[PDB]
Amino acid sequence: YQGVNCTEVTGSNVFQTRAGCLIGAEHVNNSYECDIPIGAGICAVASQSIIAYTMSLGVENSVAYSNNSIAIPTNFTISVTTEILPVSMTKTSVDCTMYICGDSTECSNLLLQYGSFCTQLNRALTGIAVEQDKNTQEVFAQVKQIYKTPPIKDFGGFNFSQILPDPSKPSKRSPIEDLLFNKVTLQKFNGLTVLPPLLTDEMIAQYTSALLAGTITSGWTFGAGPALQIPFPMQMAYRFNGIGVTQNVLYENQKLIANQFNSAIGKIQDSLSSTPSALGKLQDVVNQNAQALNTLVKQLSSNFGAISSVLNDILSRLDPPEAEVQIDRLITGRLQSLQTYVTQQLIRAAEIRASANLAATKMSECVLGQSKRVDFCGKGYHLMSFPQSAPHGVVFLHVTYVPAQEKNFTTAPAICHDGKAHFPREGVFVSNGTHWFVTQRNFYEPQIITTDNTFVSGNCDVVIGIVNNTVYDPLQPELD
Amino acid sequence: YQGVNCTEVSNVFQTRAGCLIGAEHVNNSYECDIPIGAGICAVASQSIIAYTMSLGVENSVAYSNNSIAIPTNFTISVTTEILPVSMTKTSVDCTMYICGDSTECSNLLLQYGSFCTQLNRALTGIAVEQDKNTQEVFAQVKQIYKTPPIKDFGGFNFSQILPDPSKPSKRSPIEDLLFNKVTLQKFNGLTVLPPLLTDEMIAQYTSALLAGTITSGWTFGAGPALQIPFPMQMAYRFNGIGVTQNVLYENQKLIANQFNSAIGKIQDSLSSTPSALGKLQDVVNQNAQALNTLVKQLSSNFGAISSVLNDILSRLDPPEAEVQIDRLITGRLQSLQTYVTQQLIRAAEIRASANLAATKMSECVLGQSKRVDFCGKGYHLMSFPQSAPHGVVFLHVTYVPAQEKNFTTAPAICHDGKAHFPREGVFVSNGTHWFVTQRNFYEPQIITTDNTFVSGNCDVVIGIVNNTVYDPLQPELD
Amino acid sequence: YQGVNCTEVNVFQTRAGCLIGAEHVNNSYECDIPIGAGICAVASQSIIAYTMSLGVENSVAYSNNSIAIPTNFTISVTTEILPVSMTKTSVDCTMYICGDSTECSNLLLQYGSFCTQLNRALTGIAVEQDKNTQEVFAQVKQIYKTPPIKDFGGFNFSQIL
Amino acid sequence: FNGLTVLPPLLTDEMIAQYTSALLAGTITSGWTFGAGPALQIPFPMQMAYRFNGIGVTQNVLYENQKLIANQFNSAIGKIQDSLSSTPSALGKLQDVVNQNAQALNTLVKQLSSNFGAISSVLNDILSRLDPPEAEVQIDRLITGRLQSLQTYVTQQLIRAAEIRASANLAATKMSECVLGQSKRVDFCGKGYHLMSFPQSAPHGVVFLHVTYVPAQEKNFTTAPAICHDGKAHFPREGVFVSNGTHWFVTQRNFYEPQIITTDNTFVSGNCDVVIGIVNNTVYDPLQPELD
Numbered sequence A: 001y002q003g004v005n006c007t008e009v010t011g012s013n014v015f016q017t018r019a020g021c022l023i024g025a026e027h028v029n030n031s032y033e034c035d036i037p038i039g040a041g042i043c044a045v046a047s048q049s050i051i052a053y054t055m056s057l058g059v060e061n062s063v064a065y066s067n068n069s070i071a072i073p074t075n076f077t078i079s080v081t082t083e084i085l086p087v088s089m090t091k092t093s094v095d096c097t098m099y100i101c102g103d104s105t106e107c108s109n110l111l112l113q114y115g116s117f118c119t120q121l122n123r124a125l126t127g128i129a130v131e132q133d134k135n136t137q138e139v140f141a142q143v144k145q146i147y148k149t150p151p152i153k154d155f156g157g158f159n160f161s162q163i164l165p166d167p168s169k170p171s172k173r174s175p176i177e178d179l180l181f182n183k184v185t186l187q188k189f190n191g192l193t194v195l196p197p198l199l200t201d202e203m204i205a206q207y208t209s210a211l212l213a214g215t216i217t218s219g220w221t222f223g224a225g226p227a228l229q230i231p232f233p234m235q236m237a238y239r240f241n242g243i244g245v246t247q248n249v250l251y252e253n254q255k256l257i258a259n260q261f262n263s264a265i266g267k268i269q270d271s272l273s274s275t276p277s278a279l280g281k282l283q284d285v286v287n288q289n290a291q292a293l294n295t296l297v298k299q300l301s302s303n304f305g306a307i308s309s310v311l312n313d314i315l316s317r318l319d320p321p322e323a324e325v326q327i328d329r330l331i332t333g334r335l336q337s338l339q340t341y342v343t344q345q346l347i348r349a350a351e352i353r354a355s356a357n358l359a360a361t362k363m364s365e366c367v368l369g370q371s372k373r374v375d376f377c378g379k380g381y382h383l384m385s386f387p388q389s390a391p392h393g394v395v396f397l398h399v400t401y402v403p404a405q406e407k408n409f410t411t412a413p414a415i416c417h418d419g420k421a422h423f424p425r426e427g428v429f430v431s432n433g434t435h436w437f438v439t440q441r442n443f444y445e446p447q448i449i450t451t452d453n454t455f456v457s458g459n460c461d462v463v464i465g466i467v468n469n470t471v472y473d474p475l476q477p478e479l480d
Numbered sequence B: 001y002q003g004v005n006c007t008e009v010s011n012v013f014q015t016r017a018g019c020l021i022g023a024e025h026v027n028n029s030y031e032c033d034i035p036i037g038a039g040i041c042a043v044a045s046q047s048i049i050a051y052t053m054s055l056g057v058e059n060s061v062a063y064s065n066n067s068i069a070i071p072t073n074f075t076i077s078v079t080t081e082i083l084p085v086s087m088t089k090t091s092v093d094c095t096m097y098i099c100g101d102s103t104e105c106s107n108l109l110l111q112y113g114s115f116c117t118q119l120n121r122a123l124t125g126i127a128v129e130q131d132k133n134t135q136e137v138f139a140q141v142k143q144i145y146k147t148p149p150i151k152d153f154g155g156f157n158f159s160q161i162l163p164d165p166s167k168p169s170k171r172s173p174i175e176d177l178l179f180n181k182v183t184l185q186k187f188n189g190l191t192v193l194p195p196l197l198t199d200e201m202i203a204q205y206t207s208a209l210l211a212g213t214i215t216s217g218w219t220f221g222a223g224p225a226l227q228i229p230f231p232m233q234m235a236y237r238f239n240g241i242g243v244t245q246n247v248l249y250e251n252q253k254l255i256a257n258q259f260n261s262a263i264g265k266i267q268d269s270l271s272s273t274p275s276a277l278g279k280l281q282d283v284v285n286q287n288a289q290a291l292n293t294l295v296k297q298l299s300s301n302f303g304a305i306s307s308v309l310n311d312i313l314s315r316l317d318p319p320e321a322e323v324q325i326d327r328l329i330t331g332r333l334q335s336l337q338t339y340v341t342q343q344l345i346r347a348a349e350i351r352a353s354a355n356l357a358a359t360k361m362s363e364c365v366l367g368q369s370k371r372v373d374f375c376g377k378g379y380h381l382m383s384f385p386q387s388a389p390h391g392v393v394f395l396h397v398t399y400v401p402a403q404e405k406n407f408t409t410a411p412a413i414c415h416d417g418k419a420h421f422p423r424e425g426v427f428v429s430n431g432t433h434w435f436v437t438q439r440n441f442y443e444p445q446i447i448t449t450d451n452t453f454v455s456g457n458c459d460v461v462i463g464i465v466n467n468t469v470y471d472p473l474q475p476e477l478d
Numbered sequence C: 001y002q003g004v005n006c007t008e009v010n011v012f013q014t015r016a017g018c019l020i021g022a023e024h025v026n027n028s029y030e031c032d033i034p035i036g037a038g039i040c041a042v043a044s045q046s047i048i049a050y051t052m053s054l055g056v057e058n059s060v061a062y063s064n065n066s067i068a069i070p071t072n073f074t075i076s077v078t079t080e081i082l083p084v085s086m087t088k089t090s091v092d093c094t095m096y097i098c099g100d101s102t103e104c105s106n107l108l109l110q111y112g113s114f115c116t117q118l119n120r121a122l123t124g125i126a127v128e129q130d131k132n133t134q135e136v137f138a139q140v141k142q143i144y145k146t147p148p149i150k151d152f153g154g155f156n157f158s159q160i161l
Numbered sequence D: 001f002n003g004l005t006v007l008p009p010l011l012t013d014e015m016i017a018q019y020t021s022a023l024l025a026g027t028i029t030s031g032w033t034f035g036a037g038p039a040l041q042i043p044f045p046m047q048m049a050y051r052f053n054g055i056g057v058t059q060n061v062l063y064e065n066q067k068l069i070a071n072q073f074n075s076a077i078g079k080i081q082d083s084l085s086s087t088p089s090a091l092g093k094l095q096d097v098v099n100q101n102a103q104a105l106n107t108l109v110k111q112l113s114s115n116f117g118a119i120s121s122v123l124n125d126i127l128s129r130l131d132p133p134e135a136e137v138q139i140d141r142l143i144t145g146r147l148q149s150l151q152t153y154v155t156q157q158l159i160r161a162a163e164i165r166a167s168a169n170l171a172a173t174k175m176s177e178c179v180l181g182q183s184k185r186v187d188f189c190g191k192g193y194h195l196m197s198f199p200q201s202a203p204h205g206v207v208f209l210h211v212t213y214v215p216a217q218e219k220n221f222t223t224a225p226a227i228c229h230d231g232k233a234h235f236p237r238e239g240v241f242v243s244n245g246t247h248w249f250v251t252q253r254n255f256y257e258p259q260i261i262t263t264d265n266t267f268v269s270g271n272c273d274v275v276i277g278i279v280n281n282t283v284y285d286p287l288q289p290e291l292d
């Protein structure tokens, strides 16, 4: 009971919160993750009872910051994450005269003095129905040509059978898009029609297959100009080069990267097939639209203060000039309900338009390229991503680089040699205790400190924290 | 006919979207011109045709085991992006819209409370935020920058976008033809407030932005304006997309000629193409349509005996006039409330579009963009702001690659048991000899120790060819 | 006086209307009170009206072979303020419209689902505000803690920690 | 009030402050890496060295000006509290939302006293002196007036909640791309070249402290796009050719450090006859005095 102080009145056990007080739950003293929200930091089954607790925000981890210590990963994991965004709705259209005014010329002659309200609501719903197809074309119709995969799948160990369309299945869908269509589940009444979308469900999938074939074949050059093909290890090597990792890492770990990619792609179908409400962002759109239509039909049964809600029943036993004011209450109540429906559909269409603009932005900046912006295409350093078609939406499979298996190294800002301060060209100076090396920042790869990976500026008396080591000059064994 | 079958009523064709009469069904597909629904679109060969839309030309790119396509040329191109930022600052009067000059219905209007005050406050908030949208988009410079009096930009011509001193309004030809392309109520108590920034001041803001970017690059959007030679600015804008700057210094005349041709095509495309200013014509048409139905809803009776207030106050005494007065006030009040609701929903969309236009000004005009398909199709270099009536036009100058060769590659080169990886660019080969070139242009170089780096040995990479990596140290010692 | 001529009772005619009580000056300032159509509005014991000045003019010395390389810099901290949530309010329709009266409530139930639609919409707003706050602030999987020794190389964080 | 209740937020101000404290400790002790994967520790000079390296400034500029950069940062951080204490209406974006919500609530309370054509506005008086079959329409006018005012308030809160949801999506994007990393987007995380950002808890909002790199003092120099040497044209590998009047130097674009033009600082492309407006100078090959 929120907003009461329960010294006044099931009554099992009573705890006083700041969000009211809660009856029937035991207040434990240890904190967990918030499972059922209540309010004011209190959340709510464990140990044969419903428990109530102050939430735990996360596991506390004080990372070992130090004077001259750095942490660089010696390995990585490649994780694929899903993001689900709705792009469109059902294009509903309401005939106002048939809706408030079913087959009665008496209400029609009573309705012509209300003016242009019904064609205003029809214009608003028509603009909504034009806006949904514009949203779908702005999300999916971004490639100028339809690209096709090669008949041989020689991608260097990278397996795309879960993502590319399968000709054995009808309407040319992937297993992931097929399970999305099986996990998203979708009549004709008085005055209500549902306009079909301009882009059909088998043919939005042709745009997604064209984008997938163009991405896998050509990198991002099809999004810029003509589609310039590339081997897929070379494509993933320069996508590794876009996030500060040198190209030799994939060329020395290519089978591990291919196996991690295939395992992470195969875990996606199992994760969104075994996790409930992962497609809730698509399910709530269909549920809100169908519930708004069900409320719109259900407000025809309201009397609005009249003797009955049936227009022929209140005409069949009453005179015309009291049946006039009995009809007119139903006209103003059903017209107010119809304007409420059109207003809520306009606000929901604005929300769907904002989500579709976000989906088209994510399609352009994750699918047609590689994003340097953090957490816009998944958690981790973004490599590449995969669009998948969905009922009234789009699903992105963000393939991201995630570091793992770190080790401490003792670092320094600069290294003094012969009175000169050496700074790293790409990367940092690290040490394991005895010797100093130069590594790149995102991967542990120790190298001998030379003059072609360091640069010289200034002296050693100006840099705070400079250490002393030697720098190997490559001219020395030829001079010796 | 939308929601029916083709069993109830010169040629009748059944579609999935309904029953279509008057269009011939043609098997082969075309690009969609008039949308119907469910993939069917609809004049060609003096008749109306009906077809499934074509999804673009279909080509299969020759994916190979070991080949990259690398361009030998490029076409620099200018695309237009047109975004609305504002609407007309409309404001109505409550008692003059609902009643007018009648205190004996003003007393019944005071029985409804603050229904005047809520709609006036909402329309006032819209009229304040429409100036905030224009200020947030155009007012991004601290200082008003001016062009040099001579125009020696290395070959680049900017007379289409710089303002003309012979013009009495101090506008560019592109901004003037944008002003001459769109075409545009104040009678019963509804007013149109003028904007805070006039068109000359908005053109002065865009001229300050234009002179600032051609004089400084991206430095004036960050800090103080640091001057640049403009070929060196375009070379440093090539250097941000992956092309080395030597390509511009060898092809500067071709870049200037293609840029001037692509800029001169913009005025011809905006003059010739019908409904080019669609997103700015649509907001003016929507505001005019809402204003027209706001005026036209006074002619409705709303159950009263006459729509005009003056004759029913002239022919009924108040204790039976007030039944008609209450119906007229209720109908006009909920009509005005409907208008304010649709104007708030439209003003949220205009606010989102103006936020997008200010964001596109900030990282297309004031800087260089690495997020692709956000500042035009292709590799973005820079863009030009152009003022527009209740809108802004971006002239996105992008780098689009031209014709290419298909080559043959290898990801690593083994030399004396050591695997050599390229620092920038990839290895290519035209059949016999191997070269190092950059990715976005074919500039083949001899494989040296300078442009390649070594890591590991030759048993870890799955495809390696064997060549000689030539260092200058052995001939300059021998 | 909005959108009229100055013929219907100092006097200054603007495009936005007839301005009475503000003197017109020739020179321009940065805008203080917005009037409209480039006019803005206290200085020298009176209310002034002026044309807007968009800034200070700066002809940057363009040459075909001249660079301005910065020899020095500054480190600037700016504040950006963004709202993320509002107050989770809710109304009861029966107690608001129809307080403690079943003889109004029996005719309020004749209107259908109007006032449970409003409750459902405000419930969705109140759910949406917590989703907004969690989406903005809850972006870490772990709660991180600063070390007790503030050896940050000369950088002071006590105003921020 | 009568029917109006205010639900408290799920996250209290201590928990929002602990989220911002976790974000601040994460960004101070690890840079950008805690938003990507695990929080990997780094010294804060080397963190600021990579954040200088992201905007075209080499790390040696910070490593020779670390005390000046720390003093400028501490002065600019200490100016924030003084500016927020002495400048009114800086928090107007947080003031207007609670002003609009409380003002809409006060309007919803004040519309209860409206008549809408009734003989009195309070329900109990028009109930208590009238019979029900004559009083039903007398109730029903107040019913439809209060219902129209309530659905007006719900429509206004829906449009305002859409606006606050758009602002919260912008704030979450600015958190993820200014706090959890370094952004190359111009004017997205403050005026200037963005280094790093600081979230701060606010009542119904968030305040970002964007640390930016702004250049201060510039000098004129004469350029050349290439340097001629024995028929070859040398183009800058990184930075610009500058001259003080007599001798030519290579410096980076965002800071003035002149170095001698060497063969490891430029690259050879083509000849001098194709590039317009280039000068003649000497590019010194470093191995020649080593063998000589």
Ligand SMILES: *[C@@H]1O[C@H](CO)[C@@H](O[C@@H]2O[C@H](CO)[C@@H](O)[C@H](O)[C@H]2NC(C)=O)[C@H](O)[C@H]1NC(C)=O
Residues within 6 Å of the ligand: A064, A071, A406, A407, A408
């Ligand atoms: C890096 O080394 C430091 C110290 O050498 C480790 O920090 C210690 O972590 C344990 C874990 O609970 C604490 O009990 C110690 O007090 C910490 N010591 C110091 C000096 O902070 C740190 O765990 C190492 N990091 C990794 C990834 O191995």
Ligand SMILES: *[C@@H]1O[C@H](CO)[C@@H](O[C@@H]2O[C@H](CO)[C@@H](O)[C@H](O)[C@H]2NC(C)=O)[C@H](O)[C@H]1NC(C)=O
Residues within 6 Å of the ligand: A153, A159, A160, A161
């Ligand atoms: C890509 O992954 C799929 C999924 O494992 C592979 O399909 C399997 O193929 C083997 C035969 O090689 C069958 O025994 C399995 O039953 C298949 N699994 C499923 C789930 O159908 C597919 O072969 C892989 N592609 C390549 C080129 O190896």
Ligand SMILES: *[C@@H]1O[C@H](CO)[C@@H](O[C@@H]2O[C@H](CO)[C@@H](O)[C@H](O)[C@H]2NC(C)=O)[C@H](O)[C@H]1NC(C)=O
Residues within 6 Å of the ligand: B060, B061, B062, B404, B405, B406, B407
């Ligand atoms: C690079 O070579 C490939 C194959 O050698 C070319 O692909 C063929 O191009 C011809 C052009 O007349 C077509 O008729 C063939 O059908 C293509 N074959 C395949 C399998 O696609 C490719 O076009 C060449 N690239 C360039 C730019 O010339």
Ligand SMILES: *[C@@H]1O[C@H](CO)[C@@H](O[C@@H]2O[C@H](CO)[C@@H](O)[C@H](O)[C@H]2NC(C)=O)[C@H](O)[C@H]1NC(C)=O
Residues within 6 Å of the ligand: B072, B073, B074, B075, B254, B257, B258
């Ligand atoms: C790159 O493309 C340009 C055109 O985009 C080529 O320039 C043309 O060259 C022909 C050669 O006879 C001239 O007739 C044309 O007038 C040129 N056009 C322009 C706009 O200058 C150029 O030759 C191409 N270069 C390469 C190496 O293919």
Ligand SMILES: *[C@@H]1O[C@H](CO)[C@@H](O[C@@H]2O[C@H](CO)[C@@H](O)[C@H](O)[C@H]2NC(C)=O)[C@H](O)[C@H]1NC(C)=O
Residues within 6 Å of the ligand: B157, B158, B159
């Ligand atoms: C920059 O472009 C403008 C526009 O194309 C050039 O103006 C043209 O000048 C010629 C004279 O040689 C006239 O015949 C054209 O009619 C002009 N065009 C227009 C639209 O008026 C201008 O000459 C160019 N600047 C330079 C230095 O070449």
Ligand SMILES: *[C@@H]1O[C@H](CO)[C@@H](O[C@@H]2O[C@H](CO)[C@@H](O)[C@H](O)[C@H]2NC(C)=O)[C@H](O)[C@H]1NC(C)=O
Residues within 6 Å of the ligand: C072, C073, D068, D071, D072
């Ligand atoms: C770059 O700018 C800073 C700040 O303006 C200069 O630091 C000042 O230097 C003067 C004299 O050297 C001192 O009196 C001030 O106290 C310093 N201010 C601060 C905040 O440290 C710095 O000298 C400039 N660099 C150059 C090379 O001129």
Ligand SMILES: *[C@@H]1O[C@H](CO)[C@@H](O[C@@H]2O[C@H](CO)[C@@H](O)[C@H](O)[C@H]2NC(C)=O)[C@H](O)[C@H]1NC(C)=O
Residues within 6 Å of the ligand: C156, C157, C158, C159
């Ligand atoms: C970091 O900056 C803060 C600024 O407040 C310094 O704290 C102040 O120190 C002086 C010196 O004793 C005290 O008089 C003030 O009362 C302190 N202010 C506060 C708010 O505590 C702090 O000393 C600085 N840290 C270092 C290491 O210099």
Ligand SMILES: *[C@@H]1O[C@H](CO)[C@@H](O[C@@H]2O[C@H](CO)[C@@H](O)[C@H](O)[C@H]2NC(C)=O)[C@H](O)[C@H]1NC(C)=O
Residues within 6 Å of the ligand: C061, D218, D219, D220
């Ligand atoms: C670079 O050179 C230009 C021109 O030689 C300088 O611009 C002059 O600045 C002074 C400052 O008041 C003006 O009075 C002159 O009229 C300007 N000259 C021109 C031609 O506009 C500029 O100041 C120099 N830059 C620096 C940093 O000194």
Ligand SMILES: *[C@@H]1O[C@H](CO)[C@@H](O)[C@H](O)[C@H]1NC(C)=O
Residues within 6 Å of the ligand: A005, A007
């Ligand atoms: C709630 O009741 C307790 C019990 O007396 C009292 O101490 C407390 O002050 C009350 N709080 C409020 C807000 O009335």
Ligand SMILES: *[C@@H]1O[C@H](CO)[C@@H](O)[C@H](O)[C@H]1NC(C)=O
Residues within 6 Å of the ligand: A074, A075, A076, A256, A405
């Ligand atoms: C990196 O992790 C993978 C886990 O799949 C493991 O197989 C591999 O050996 C690890 N590499 C190193 C160098 O530890």
Ligand SMILES: *[C@@H]1O[C@H](CO)[C@@H](O)[C@H](O)[C@H]1NC(C)=O
Residues within 6 Å of the ligand: A067, A068, A464, A465, A466
């Ligand atoms: C480590 O801390 C000591 C003081 O305890 C200091 O003198 C030294 O300079 C620090 N080292 C580095 C690299 O900052």
Ligand SMILES: *[C@@H]1O[C@H](CO)[C@@H](O)[C@H](O)[C@H]1NC(C)=O
Residues within 6 Å of the ligand: B027
């Ligand atoms: C169109 O195609 C279908 C099947 O492809 C065929 O049966 C029909 O005759 C074609 N129509 C015309 C006019 O060629």
Ligand SMILES: *[C@@H]1O[C@H](CO)[C@@H](O)[C@H](O)[C@H]1NC(C)=O
Residues within 6 Å of the ligand: B065, B066, B462, B463, B464
């Ligand atoms: C190229 O094709 C051959 C045979 O078709 C195959 O053995 C080899 O693994 C392929 N890949 C390379 C060289 O990367």
Ligand SMILES: *[C@@H]1O[C@H](CO)[C@@H](O)[C@H](O)[C@H]1NC(C)=O
Residues within 6 Å of the ligand: C004, C005, C006, C007
């Ligand atoms: C106001 O009246 C004067 C008198 O004729 C006229 O010259 C002027 O144009 C009028 N101004 C407007 C804005 O109507």
Ligand SMILES: *[C@@H]1O[C@H](CO)[C@@H](O)[C@H](O)[C@H]1NC(C)=O
Residues within 6 Å of the ligand: C024, C025, C026
């Ligand atoms: C403004 O300038 C005009 C033009 O000379 C002059 O007549 C007038 O007196 C000036 N007004 C003021 C207030 O300076």
Ligand SMILES: *[C@@H]1O[C@H](CO)[C@@H](O)[C@H](O)[C@H]1NC(C)=O
Residues within 6 Å of the ligand: D244, D245, D246, D247
């Ligand atoms: C220009 O630089 C050279 C090289 O250091 C120096 O000798 C000369 O004095 C400088 N001239 C001026 C005017 O600064």
